[PDB]
């Protein structure tokens, strides 16, 4: 007449869990992410058809972000390692002005510099020349000739680079769970971390995510479909950043309108080095365009959403950042392998109140580059010949609020985001991982 | 008809499969292939004859060859990685003659090179000299004094090589299947390549195969038990090579008939370099002695076999190769670490028709050698003291057909082929690898 303990196996029960996901490629041979160890996967989605289970999960709890971050850094080292060290070039560098019809706002940007260099034989040294960008060159002695410079990072970890074939194309990588695990995708198109997701469909493999890395305006990511969503770990914390996911793409057209020559020399025994040569045509500043309408009016949507976290009849202002290292001060992206830094002066200036014309931002070029989060290594960015033009999609903003405001008005926001991880937090916000626990017990009646 | 399915487990069914076989060995301390880590071999492999089985499998499409290829190349570098780099020696060499009694074949073969050597302290260099073979030395400048030369590859990837301690003996390695896999073996000696084998047995491990590298003749391999066999993928496709397995060895006695000394220098911190010192006695060229009668019989037998698939009233000419770089114009082989490049024209200068006394083949010696499959890596063979007398068995040939002839007659064959995969084709023709599939459907009468 009483109840008995029965074990059931194959029970559909979830447990919060952590493990790793596998690299799953979909359709020059190898890139940081296009890793040689990566397994082509099944393009067919594995849906559970919106099975009616409500689950609460969030960002900044999601350890998958940490894995994407670590995997990418590991991958960088793997592709960067089997390349030519540039240590032989850490010599006194002899600099003067480039004199080629320079436009006034480009004066001082480029340096014509000579140096001694190693060659095929170890008892021989030769005189060589190249063109450098000002930002990476530092003066060594006011007391001596005003022409003596060194490269910015010769007194720290060696700067290395070769492998010109390899690109930096941010090829999307899909991630797959091991058997015994499942990935929960939130199908709510209007959620935030402030509550549970009513509609979840698990998968074995996610869609691909492009490892695009940016410092201020996130490019080529997932766009919101129904509205603009603003997310934060703590909406009232001045120490946290703000992620703005736009539902409106903004097109941005970038260029370095200077026709370059790439020259190369032998440094040593099969050790090649590539460098900037003769620039032909006028010297002009690199720049990026957006239209005013797609920026200025788009921000009004952002403002309407900001006002949902702030009160009514609140004034909102945009402004430029407080500064700091170039890496955080300006917008930064890579294209063609080149690293561009842009001053968003025309983007964050206006004030919003309760009640063909473009924007052009000036940009600069840098070649000796550390990793966003570390200085124990440095890499050199090789030159690109001819003229480079790039077009990208702005999908979101990373903003920083000021240290409060007086009586909840004139709330000021600036470009921000100092955490490289923000680039994946913005994509993985829809996913959680659990383990499968097939055993369980319930009362019943039998023998 | 009122029947039901049973399933039997432990069913004897095979599936073609490609997996890794592992290095098996009887056991000086450091060999290139007989490495520190290799698993002891089964002293008693169990060969099981299969009654009522005919199994078809390939030659030349057999991936066991590919597995040895990738492993031998990768291992070559791993075992020979921690060697002294010879980069420090890339200085100009001031070249003069050798102060000895030099014979007429040796004129121009050796050079006496003088240079400023790097010592273990950064403050010192010394006057040093060494002897080199002509093949490895290139003139630096006709414009300047025609006495300055360089090592052949100082203007490309650096040459690295020391490791005098490493054994290069071609110790045979056995390959064993993982559980769940089996190796099938063909005992039909009359098979001509790919087709059904009516006489088979299975094994757990293959016999051992000696890693002998060669560009023309097959040395110390598997010998035919009855008659010379000629096998190829397509007898009329001259883009493919020809494998000839002999049923008798041909003994060949090779020498570098000069009593050598060795000198050395410390270049850096334990960075020792060894080089050819002077010569005791006079100077004579390297050579190999092949029995004429044996060789004549050898090619006569080859012709008898050629005539099985080709017709009569054809004169078969044996000729020296048409050309190419050294590796494909000479018979390359290694004798105790010494690298011989022998001229075999003396072996292929005759005709056959359908109706002791040795051949003293001249040889050259070379020390700067590129890896067989690539030129991104090279090594400087260490000098060897004393006089070497190298004795080996010719167990086969790799031949190339001079395809294209008037009226399909008077064919000519030449030696050649430097592709290492072709040196394992004979030994591996007997083996196939399959997966074991233990479940099978068993229709019957039970419930």
């Amino acid at each position, epitope marked *: 007449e009483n109840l008995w303990v029965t074990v059931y196996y194959g029970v559909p029960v979830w447990k919060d869990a952590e493990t790793t996901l596998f690299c799953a490629s979909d359709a020059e041979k190898h890139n940081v992410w296009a890793t040689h160890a990566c397994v082509p996967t099944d393009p067919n989605p594995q849906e559970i058809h919106l099975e009616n289970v409500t689950e609460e999960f969030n960002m900044w709890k999601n350890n998958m972000v940490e894995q994407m971050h670590e995997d990418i850094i590991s991958l960088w080292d793997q592709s960067l390692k089997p390349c030519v060290k540039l240590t032989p070039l850490c010599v006194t560098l002899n600099c003067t002005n480039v004199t080629n019809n320079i436009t006034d706002d480009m004066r001082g940007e480029l340096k014509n510099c000579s140096f001694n260099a190693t060659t095929e034989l170890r008892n021989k*040294r030769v005189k060589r020349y190249s063109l450098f960008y000002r930002l990476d060159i530092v003066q060594i002695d006011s007391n001596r000739t005003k022409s003596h410079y060194r490269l910015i990072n010769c007194n720290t970890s060696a700067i290395t680079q070769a492998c010109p074939k390899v690109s930096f194309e941010p090829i999307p990588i899909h991630y797959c769970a091991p058997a015994g695990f499942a990935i929960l995708k939130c199908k709510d198109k209007k959620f935030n971390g402030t509550g549970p997701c009513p509609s979840v469909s698990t998968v074995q493999c996610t869609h691909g995510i492009k490892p695009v890395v940016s410092t201020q305006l996130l490019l080529n990511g997932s766009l919101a479909e129904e509205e603009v969503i603003i997310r934060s770990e703590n909406i009232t914390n001045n120490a946290k950043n703000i992620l703005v996911q736009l539902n409106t793409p903004v097109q941005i057209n970038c260029t370095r309108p200077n026709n370059n020559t790439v020259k190369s020399i032998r440094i040593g025994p099969g050790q090649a080095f590539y460098y900037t040569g003769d620039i032909i045509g006028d010297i002009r500043q690199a720049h990026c365009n957006v239209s005013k309408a797609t920026w200025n009016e788009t921000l009004g949507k952002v403002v309407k959403q900001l006002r949902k976290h702030f009160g009514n009849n609140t004034i909102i202002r945009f402004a430029q950042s407080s500064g700091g290292d170039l890496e955080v001060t300006t917008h930064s992206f890579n294209c063609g392998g080149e690293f561009f830094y842009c001053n968003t002066s025309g983007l964050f200036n206006s004030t919003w109140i309760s009640n063909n014309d473009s924007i052009t931002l000036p940009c600069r070029i840098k070649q000796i580059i550390n990793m966003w989060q570390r200085i124990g290594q440095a890499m050199y960015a090789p030159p690109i010949q001819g003229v480079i033009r790039c077009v990208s999609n702005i999908t979101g903003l990373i903003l920083t609020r000021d240290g409060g405001s007086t009586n909840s008005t004139t709330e000021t926001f600036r470009p921000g985001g100092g955490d490289m991880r923000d680039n994946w937090r913005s994509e993985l916000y829809k996913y959680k991982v659990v383990k499968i626990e097939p055993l369980g017990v319930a009362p019943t009646r039998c023998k | 008809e009122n029947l039901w399915v049973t399933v039997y487990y432990g069913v004897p069914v095979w599936k073609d499969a490609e997996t890794t076989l592992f290095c098996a060995s009887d056991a000086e301390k450091h060999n290139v292939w007989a490495t520190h880590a290799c698993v002891p071999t089964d002293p008693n492999p169990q060969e099981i004859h299969l009654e009522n089985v005919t199994e078809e499998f390939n030659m030349w499409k057999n991936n066991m060859v590919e597995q040895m290829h990738e492993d031998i190349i990768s291992l070559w570098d791993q075992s020979l990685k921690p060697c002294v780099k010879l980069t420090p020696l890339c200085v100009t060499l001031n070249c003069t003659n050798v102060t000895n009694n030099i014979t007429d074949d040796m004129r121009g073969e050796l050079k006496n090179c003088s240079f400023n050597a790097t010592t273990e302290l950064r403050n010192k260099r010394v006057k040093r000299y060494s002897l080199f073979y002509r093949l490895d030395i290139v003139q630096i400048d006709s414009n300047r004094t025609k006495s300055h030369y360089r090592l052949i590859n100082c203007n490309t990837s650096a040459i690295t090589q020391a490791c005098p301690k490493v054994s290069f003996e071609p110790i045979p390695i056995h390959y064993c299947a993982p559980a769940g896999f089996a190796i099938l073996k063909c005992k039909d000696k009359k098979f001509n390549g790919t087709g059904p084998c009516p006489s088979v047995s299975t094994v757990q491990c293959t016999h051992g195969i000696k890693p002998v590298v060669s560009t023309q003749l097959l040395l110390n391999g598997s010998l035919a038990e009855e008659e010379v066999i000629i096998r190829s993928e397509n007898i009329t496709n001259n883009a493919k090579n020809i494998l000839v397995q002999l049923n008798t060895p041909v003994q060949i006695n090779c020498t570098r008939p000069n009593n050598n000394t060795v000198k050395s220098i410390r270049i850096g911190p334990g960075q020792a370099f060894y080089y050819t010192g002077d010569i005791i006695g006079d100077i004579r060229q390297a050579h190999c002695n092949v029995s004429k009668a044996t060789w004549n019989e050898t090619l006569g037998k080859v012709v008898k076999q050629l005539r099985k698939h080709f017709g009569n009233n054809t004169i078969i000419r044996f000729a020296q190769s048409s050309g190419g770089d050294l590796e494909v114009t000479t018979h390359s082989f290694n004798c105790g670490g010494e690298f011989f490049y022998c001229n075999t024209s003396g072996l292929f200068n005759s005709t056959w028709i359908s109706n002791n006394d040795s051949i003293t083949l001249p040889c050259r010696i070379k020390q700067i050698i590129n890896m067989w499959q690539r030129i991104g890596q090279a090594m400087y063979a260490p000098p060897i003291q004393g006089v070497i007398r190298c004795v080996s068995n010719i167990t086969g040939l790799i031949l190339t057909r001079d395809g294209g002839s008037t009226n399909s007659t008077t064919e000519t064959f030449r030696p050649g082929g430097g592709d290492m995969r072709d040196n394992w084709r004979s030994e591996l023709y007997k083996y196939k690898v399959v997966k074991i599939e233990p479940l099978g459907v068993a229709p019957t009468r039970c419930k």
Partner: antibody
Amino acid sequence: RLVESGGGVVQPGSSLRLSCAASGFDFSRQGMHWVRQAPGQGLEWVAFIKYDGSEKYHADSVWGRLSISRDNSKDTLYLQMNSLRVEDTATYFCVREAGGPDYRNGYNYYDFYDGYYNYHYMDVWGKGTTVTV
Amino acid sequence: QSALTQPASVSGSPGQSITISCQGTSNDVGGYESVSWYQQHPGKAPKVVIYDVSKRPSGVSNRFSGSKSGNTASLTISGLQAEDEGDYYCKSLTSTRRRVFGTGTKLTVL
């Protein structure tokens, strides 16, 4: 081996062009000089040209009228002499400048495109050719 | 650009030590150690006797020496021989980077 050619007898106000064939050296990496000596007189330096043609130096006494030039492919040194004066009568000589690599800190030092530095003295003289105005 | 001043002539008996002076300025002799001396056999282009103030080229004997003090330089010929007879010249480099020769000295062996 320096061989002067183009000398001859001309009238005042005329122009003459000299050339110097050369061999035995990487002409293209070494500088050259023209020197002249009027009969009964001492040596007068006329001009110097750097191996890559980047810098040229002329004596004040010959300015405007004389111009030094070179052809790396021809392995040839030239002197263009215009509006000739009787004072310009002299034997003209093709002279190779002494040079090579500076030795410093146990290394040799080259100029651009592996050029040889000026050891600062004359080494090879040609026979010379007479120019009479 | 003026010539360097040299004595019109020098002389001495065989075996005699003689000196041929050269007077320059702060822009050349007193400017660098780049001075040199040449021997011109009559009818021939000259050869280097001295370079770098006091260095000899291969083939020149140790009888040929010299020195430099301030703006004045000199060639010393010890053990004077009849075979030494010829026209001697000094040469120097300048701030303008021009090359300058002296007036030359005639040598007679008595």
